[PDB]
Amino acid sequence: NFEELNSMQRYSQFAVFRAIPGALGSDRAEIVAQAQSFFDGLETAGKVEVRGIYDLAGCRAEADFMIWWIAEEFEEIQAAFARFRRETVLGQVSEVAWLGNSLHRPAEFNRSHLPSFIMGEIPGDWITVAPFVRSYDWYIMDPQKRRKILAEHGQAARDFPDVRANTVPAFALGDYEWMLAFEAPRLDRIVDLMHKMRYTEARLHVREETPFFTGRRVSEVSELVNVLPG
Amino acid sequence: EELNSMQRYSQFAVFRAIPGALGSDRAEIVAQAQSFFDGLETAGKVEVRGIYDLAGCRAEADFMIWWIAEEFEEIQAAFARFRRETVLGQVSEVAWLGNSLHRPAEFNRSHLPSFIMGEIPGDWITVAPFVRSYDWYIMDPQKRRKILAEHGQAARDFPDVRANTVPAFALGDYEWMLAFEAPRLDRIVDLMHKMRYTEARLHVREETPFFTGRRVSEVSELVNVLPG
Amino acid sequence: NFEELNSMQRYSQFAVFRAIPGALGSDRAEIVAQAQSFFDGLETAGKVEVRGIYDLAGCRAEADFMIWWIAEEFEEIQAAFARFRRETVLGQVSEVAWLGNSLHRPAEFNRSHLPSFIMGEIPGDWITVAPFVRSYDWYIMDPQKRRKILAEHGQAARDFPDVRANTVPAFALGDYEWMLAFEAPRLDRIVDLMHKMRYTEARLHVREETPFFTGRRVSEVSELVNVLPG
Amino acid sequence: LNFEELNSMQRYSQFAVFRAIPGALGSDRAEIVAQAQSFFDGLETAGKVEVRGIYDLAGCRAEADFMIWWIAEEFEEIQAAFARFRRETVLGQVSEVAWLGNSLHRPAEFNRSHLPSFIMGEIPGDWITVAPFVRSYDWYIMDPQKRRKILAEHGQAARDFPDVRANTVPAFALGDYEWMLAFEAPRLDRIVDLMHKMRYTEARLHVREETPFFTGRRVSEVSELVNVLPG
Amino acid sequence: NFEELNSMQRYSQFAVFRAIPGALGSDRAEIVAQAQSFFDGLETAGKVEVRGIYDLAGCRAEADFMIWWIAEEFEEIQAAFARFRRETVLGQVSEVAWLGNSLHRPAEFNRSHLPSFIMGEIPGDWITVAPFVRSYDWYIMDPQKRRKILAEHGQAARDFPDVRANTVPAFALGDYEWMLAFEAPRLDRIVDLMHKMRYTEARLHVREETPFFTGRRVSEVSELVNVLPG
Ligand code: FEC
Ligand code: FEC
Ligand code: FEC
Ligand code: FEC
Ligand code: FEC
């Protein structure tokens, strides 16, 4: 029944940043120590949980890295986000590219469908994040019809148990209806999942699903900072 | 009634912080900004419903001023004065302006904006424009009336979310300005989710950008969070 | 007479400008005097008619003011636009934001429908200008159905005789089919006109109608120059 | 004319639209004019790239100030002249690329006497409007007899505008569009009126995109343009 | 059949860059030599295969050149992409304009249809690259209908065996569904192929297909660097 897990309050934010060429320089040791200190402090304060930091190099123009963090209260994410930008050189030398905000809620029909991060699953080595906006008719549609469509949609993913879904309401937290995050040990599994999921009636009820942000989880800030353009 | 006939223009003036412009020495900037707002209050022409920290809501937006006046020129003067004579306005950029003009509802004359009713502003706010489908206003009137009544019924479980829907024709690119004010952000999220389950959603063309943020108590609160 | 007004050749341009923070400064008396002389000169030269200069402060991001000028030859506007930008402090410190160009022509079915500025009517204290693009099927539609639609469109505006219309062809003069300008003594009259005109069948034949620019006609240049950001 | 030779010849066409960088030109422009004029002299001398005209787009739209229309047998020759203009002239160094409209002349599908004014070797018009074009998805798979009829009525709608010379040119894979369009006339109002009239055609039911438009006046020499540009 | 060529794992990236005016200057010989040694190094490491470097001069605003490279693992592309931007002057004076990422997979119906780069075919002297997004209904269409539509699509290109196609899944690797590249000895044949391919029923099942990037494969880096704006 997952009643407790369906009832908890957790805001989730994908903070996507772009490197400013020429800003970081080549002596990045102090910049890495400071950034690491900032994340250390977040962990100990216990309010904002960093699920991952991601190297988005080569995914798209105008984005380079992403922080996925989660908190019981959105003002806690606000504070940390603002703190990153204001009180760390890394945040001072990066530009905000895109923010994907969401608030976990129970599914309408399948109460066993819960985000990977809510289930406490270890995060995947590879991720793709994107927003979603359903067709205008999607929610006023007869409920048994929508139920059947979502049942097919889930069935279409049967061969990809290794790809972990995170489908989270984003209404009023930006321009979208949902935040999506797919975690997997291998990028090719996410590509193949997305390709297979095109073969679903649910595709007839879609309005927007970009931008996509795809990248590799790093073990520590030093691994990301060293990759960035100077 | 007298409220349905009241004249108030309302403006959501959304601003973006220019990285590197504010610096780390903001004491004088705060005091000057507070004097601007204090001066507005005692002149008594423009009412500031709230100033809002939008940090983390979206790229390219950082804070919002919601102010109201009887005449649009009064808002024009305050907006220009803020950009012209306060450092905070000089080192900020205008991201988006949401303008509206209070008018009665086409059917429900009791439906009145929270700011017209003088209600205390909410800790959390979501602001956005709205554009109906092309066919919406030439629809049969009782059909539209019924659709809007069911729309409102779907919000019954959210009496703590206060709504403001105000005409915005010719005051920019939109038909309506919306503001929802609540004591907790999650109430606003859940209201929008629930309100998707309505026939009115078959008659929508545009509803973005959204701006969501926390009301602050004084300008110092906001200035001290900005990126700098 | 009416034939003379329908056959007149008049180009019209809405030149919308954006202030550049930091360029104008705080000592503006000479800036004002110089701009007043430029427009005074325009008046006396007798080629370009300045119908108004409008404070757009607060209408939209990225615009601050607008010049509405008219001439028999588009080259006369090009010269006045180029001379404004090149030879006045005000034009040097402004960016061009949008240009709305149009060429007066007779209406298709009602040759008594003429732009306010062609009638020679005094300009209104408040204005809204915007482009317009009709649906693809509008002009090839049965002429009698389009005629009836426009007749009803006109009737829906009956309650707003104090709001003066200007509807002018804009084909090939930018990205639009028509330029619109609505002039009124109070802004609320324009807002309520636009709202009422939604209740017309012509709304089913629209493709584009943004950006809108709305503001206050100044009595002299000083009113505008003194409000702009420094 | 030799319609067969005109239809089979290979010519690429590029509308290169530029915007002046504010504050970049300055008030001392003679050296820039002499250098730019020397550049166009060189192109004419080499005989590869043909400049049909340089156009002053003042007052047409924000973010565009002038346009070069040049034509060559080989696209690489346009690439070379375009790059050399930007790289080796101050004019090109202090301007920004706003928009590029590339095309390759081909015979028309039904009326092989319909040829671009530039292929016919006609004097270029004093006024020009250029724009891309993208047809509806269904346009090409349509019954050919139906498409033919629609295009015949389209051409008929322009019967009163023989002074406006058309250039309709394929643009597939040379940018984001299906056609490049250029209409050349002795006065601007003729183009405005032609476009208005052409809305009254069935072809309008098979359109997807037709912007941005770039409209302006042909200059006689580089000096006339450089001296109008915003400082 | 082509079992091995169809099961092969290859990521492909089109990395489109734009020149930063004023950055390169007129001193370029050492920049060329450093870039050449960067690509020589990639070759010797044997992980990332550069299929071509392309001069896009004159194709479109805000793009100037493209790298087409291929690797078994996407992280190897990320590393080369990041190393190009970080450790070569050429990378540092260029801006990322657009990235076009794809992952080779077997065709749905015709497993003899394989990308030209997967077939080991020599790259073409001229290229056009673009993304693709099909209509929402494409993949749920009856399979035999879609098969028929694609067979007629392939038939329409029968006169163009000289233009070699690369159609590659792009799901989750950006905002698109497919990456397309068409390589030929002559540019005019690519234009003619695209024209002809409009005459197919598949065209009724299309949503997005831009931006296009078209240009000439260079024989060496110096041919590219010396044409770029200074
Ligand atoms: C990938 C992907 C997308 C984006 C691409 C597209 O939609 O085709 C995608 C799109 C969405 C979107 C919006 C929603 C939000 C609900 C809606 O009203 O749209 C959304 C929500 C749900 N998804 Fe979804 N998805 N999805 C999976 C992956 C993808 N999903 C995988 C895998 C599974 C299967 C495993 C799982 O349950 O964890 C799965 C199942 C569900 C269920 C549970 C249905 C059930 O089985 O009854 C719900 C609820
Ligand atoms: C949230 C939200 C939106 C945007 C999302 C959506 O469109 O689904 C939203 C959309 C709009 C838009 C445009 C209009 C403007 C009128 C029109 O023609 O569009 C608009 C206008 C009205 N709303 Fe609306 N809304 N709305 C609420 C919240 C939201 N509303 C809540 C709560 C209530 C419940 C009542 C109350 O609190 O006043 C409510 C009811 C009304 C009534 C009164 C109907 C009645 O009860 O008979 C009018 C008139
Ligand atoms: C406001 C407004 C818009 C934009 C909003 C919308 O389209 O709903 C608006 C849209 C357009 C557009 C395009 C055109 C161009 C013609 C076409 O083919 O679209 C356009 C053209 C016409 N309008 Fe229009 N309008 N419009 C008024 C206000 C607005 N109008 C008012 C007031 C009156 C009434 C007073 C007058 O004649 O001056 C009025 C009447 C006309 C007539 C004359 C009709 C007649 O036979 O009675 C013509 C022709
Ligand atoms: C202006 C204008 C446009 C853009 C606006 C619009 O689409 O309404 C415009 C749009 C297009 C477009 C795409 C094409 C490309 C073919 C396609 O399949 O769409 C395109 C192609 C053709 N046009 Fe077209 N036009 N067009 C003229 C002006 C405009 N035209 C004038 C003038 C004439 C008449 C004189 C001339 O032939 O030179 C004329 C006729 C033709 C013929 C020859 C028809 C014949 O059989 O009679 C062909 C082929
Ligand atoms: C050009 C061009 C486009 C983009 C323009 C437009 O779509 O009209 C174009 C679009 C696409 C797109 C997406 C796909 C991806 C699959 C899908 O579901 O969309 C896509 C996929 C395929 N194409 Fe395609 N194309 N295409 C060729 C050229 C173009 N193609 C040429 C040449 C040949 C023929 C030679 C070859 O097999 O390599 C050819 C054939 C195929 C086959 C094999 C069909 C078969 O014969 O049964 C498949 C699979």
Author numbering:
A (entry chain B), C (entry chain D), E (entry chain A): 6 to 235
B (entry chain E): 8 to 235
D (entry chain C): 5 to 235
Reported in the publication:
ChdCs are enzymes involved in the prokaryotic heme biosynthesis pathway mainly of monoderm bacteria, but some diderm or intermediate representatives also use this pathway. They catalyze the hydrogen peroxide–driven oxidative decarboxylation of iron coproporphyrin III (coproheme) to iron protoporphyrin IX (heme b). After initial oxidation of coproheme to Compound I (two-electron deficient reaction intermediate), a catalytic tyrosine radical is generated, which is completely essential for both decarboxylation reactions. Mechanistic studies revealed the order of decarboxylation and proved that propionate at position 2 (p2) is decarboxylated first.
Exchange of Y135 with a tryptophan, in order to mirror the situation in the active site, led to a very inactive variant (data not shown), we therefore eliminated Y135 by inserting an alanine residue (Y135A), as has proven to keep the formation of Compound I perfectly intact in previous studies. The structures clearly show that the introduced amino acids occupy the positions of the respective residues in the wild-type protein. While the distance between Y135 and Cß-p2 is about 3.1 Å in the wild-type structure, the Y183 oxygen lies about 4.4 Å above the Cß of p4. Both single mutations leave the active site and the overall structure is unaffected. Y135A, in contrast, exhibits a very similar UV–Vis spectrum to the wild type (Soret maximum at 391 with a shoulder, visible bands at 490 and 631 nm) but shows no spectral shift of the Soret maximum upon titration with H2O2. Instead, an absorbance decrease of the Soret maximum and emergence of a single band at 580 nm are observed. As there is a lack of catalytic Y135, no decarboxylation activity with H2O2 is observed in this variant. Y135A is unable to perform the decarboxylation reaction on coproheme. This variant will form Compound I in the presence of H2O2 and, due to the lack of the catalytic tyrosine for Compound I* formation, the variant will instead oxidize coproheme to get back to the ferric resting state.
